[PDB]
Amino acid sequence: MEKAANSIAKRVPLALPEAGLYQANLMSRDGDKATPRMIKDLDGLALVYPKGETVQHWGVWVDHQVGKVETNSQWLGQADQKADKDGIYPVQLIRNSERLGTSTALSSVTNDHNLITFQDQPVIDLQGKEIKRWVFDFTRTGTKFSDNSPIYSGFSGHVAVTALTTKAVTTASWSATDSFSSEMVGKVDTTNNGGKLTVAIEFPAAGCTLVGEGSATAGLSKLTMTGFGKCNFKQSAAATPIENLWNAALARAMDNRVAYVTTFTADAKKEALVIGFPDTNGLLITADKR
Ligand SMILES: [Cl-]
């Protein structure tokens, strides 16, 4: 009876997890009524941005490699908060997935289905243990590439999220898993001076450094970015399809652009910086302490 459920879903802004940083796990499911199981090594990040007065954004990013082939995906969600003229609360979902090997593939698909989040869902974690989690249903933005090859082997289109413990941003030096000066993002420098937060992001290809100011906080700290006038964000060939998407958004960005930053610890007790630019074609910067 999904159509009836979606009909009600439309009448209220989309239910999302509390604003913050999440771990995402791509799941497999065997049947429309079977319990989804997380898939090894198909983990990612998800970010729910704070609720706007008009819109709430969120995103999910996943990077996976097999052989010499990378498959990178981002899902970008926009949930309207105010009502539409038909009394509806629009939801928009976009998947961009790129497959980079000897050949190249990009698949981008939007869908405006409303009932795409599920709260307290049973999920078989990586140990075979059933647990409960928010679940995204990204089935309608597709799971295959055009040659009938699946984007991620076993992926059902369902995505579990788990809240990550985030520290506040400290004064430190970071690196977006990079490096010559040809990459999209390079050094990232953060200063936390008694709560006042400044973040400097070098964009080596664009030839500029963006600087953001904000206030330190547990979870997401809101930044206002400047520096865009000094940058050349163009469509490359040196960039991946998704990077060119990020470039297209950054080329239209202007001073006082909003971003959110937080830190957390990954596996080997190694801290990571995450900066997310809402409504910027999925721009997500992750950086290792250095
Ligand atoms: Cl489900």
Numbering used by the authors: 1 to 179, 182 to 292
From the paper:
The structure of AimA revealed two domains connected by a short linker. β-strands dominate each domain with the carboxy terminal (C-term) domain forming a complete β-barrel and the amino terminal (N-term) domain containing a curved β-sheet. Therefore, we performed structural homology searches against each domain separately, which revealed that both domains had similarity to proteins in the calycin superfamily. The N-term domain of AimA has an incomplete β-barrel, but maintains some structural homology to streptavidin. The C-term domain of AimA has structural homology both to avidins and lipocalins. The SCR1 in the C-term domain of AimA overlaps structurally with the SCR1 of mouse lipocalin-2 (mLCN2) and shares some related amino acids. However, in comparison to the wide enterobactin-binding cleft (calyx) of LCN2, the homologous regions of the N- and C-term domains of AimA are much narrower, are occluded by loops or a helix, and lack the enterobactin-interacting residues of LCN. Of these seven residues, two—Val 60/201 and Thr 117/265—stand out as possible candidates to interact with a hydrophobic ligand that could bind inside the barrel cavity.
Using the gnotobiotic zebrafish model, we identified a potent immune modulatory protein secreted by Aeromonas, which we named Aeromonas immune modulator A (AimA) because it reduces intestinal inflammation.
